[PDB]
Design a protein around this ligand. Structure first.
Ligand SMILES: CCCCCCNC(=O)c1ccc(S(N)(=O)=O)cc1
Ligand SMILES: [Zn+2]
Length: 257
């Protein structure tokens, strides 16, 4: 099955998931000079005061911090979106070295990592139905650069030792995702897809302009995770990012001037 190695990596995904070559794939390069300021975009509304984290899971491609999405606790609204999108999980993509790891790029620049806060449109009733719809998901993407530590990330990095291998999970309650946000909510937006199989074309992407800073030590601990299961030959979980895909007939809009 699919992964990030030579033999099962992004260049192979199209054979099981033909939509890999579709018309609205993600990630993309954000060309800052071509993205047009759209004065009709609203401020995003990130309402995470009542967020309820439950568990952290190594799923063999990344680790997901999962939320209680059984009612409207943590939601994303506004910006390019109509309606209410419930936070279900967040995860990251990162590199083997600081010079690569993000999925989106900004004028071809790759960041050390990228955080994805994944939300589903509650008008579809459940996540499985939402991913079948062109406006089913909203993913808030946040770049990570290496510099100063991010205090709000430390609880995540401290639990990684306990979910080293694929299929391990740990209790992860009372985590506040507001501690992973940058100061500004200025963003770019475009229609796209999940960036892992099944690559469904169901996502309104909202990518924040301001990266967060994390420390070298913090990102080093991401790279000690394993793609493999317990007792299997060790394959460090690094470079779990899909490269930029063709923009095709899409426009990336800026919320800021
Ligand atoms: C029930 C539907 C299963 C969909 C497969 C599970 N995959 C996801 O739910 C999913 C979420 C976010 C992204 S991303 N990297 O674009 O933020 C990618 C994949
Ligand atoms: Zn992702």
């Amino acid at each position: 099955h699919w992964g990030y190695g030579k033999h099962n990596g992004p260049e192979h995904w199209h054979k099981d998931f033909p939509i890999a070559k579709g018309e609205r794939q993600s990630p993309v390069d954000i060309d800052t000079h071509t993205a047009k300021y759209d004065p009709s975009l609203k401020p995003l509304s990130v309402s995470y005061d009542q967020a309820t984290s439950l568990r952290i899971l190594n799923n063999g491609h990344a680790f997901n911090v999962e939320f209680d999405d059984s009612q409207d606790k943590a939601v994303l609204k506004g910006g390019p979106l109509d309606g209410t999108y419930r936070l279900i999980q967040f995860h990251f993509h990162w590199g083997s070295l600081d010079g690569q790891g993000s999925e989106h790029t900004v004028d071809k620049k790759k960041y050390a990592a990228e955080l994805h806060l994944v939300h589903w449109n509650t008008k579809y009733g459940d996540f499985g139905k939402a991913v079948q719809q062109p406006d089913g998901l909203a993913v808030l993407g946040i770049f990570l650069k290496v510099g100063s530590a991010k205090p709000g990330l430390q609880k995540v990095v401290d639990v990684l030792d306990s979910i080293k291998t694929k299929g391990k999970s740990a209790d992860f309650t009372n985590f506040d995702p507001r501690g992973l946000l940058p100061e500004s909510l200025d963003y770019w937006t475009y229609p796209g897809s999940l960036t892992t199989p099944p690559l469904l074309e169901c996502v309104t992407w909202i990518v924040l302009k301001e990266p967060i800073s994390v420390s070298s030590e913090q990102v080093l601990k991401f790279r000690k995770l394993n793609f493999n299961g317990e007792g299997e030959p060790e394959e460090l979980m690094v470079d779990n990012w899909r490269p930029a895909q063709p923009l095709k007939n899409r426009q990336i809009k800026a919320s800021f001037k």
